[PDB]
Amino acid sequence: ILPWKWKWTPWRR
Numbered sequence: 001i002l003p004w005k006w007k008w009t010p011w012r013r
């Protein structure tokens with residue numbers, strides 16, 4: 001299992 005957690009989509013610059 002891996003709970004990726006970062007909203008849904010990564011908040012990069």
Ligand SMILES: *[C@@H]1O[C@H](CO)[C@@H](O)[C@H](O)[C@H]1O
Pocket residue numbers: 006007008009010011
């Ligand atoms: C999730 O993906 C959307 C795609 O538009 C982006 O705007 C969000 O900032 C990101 O977390």
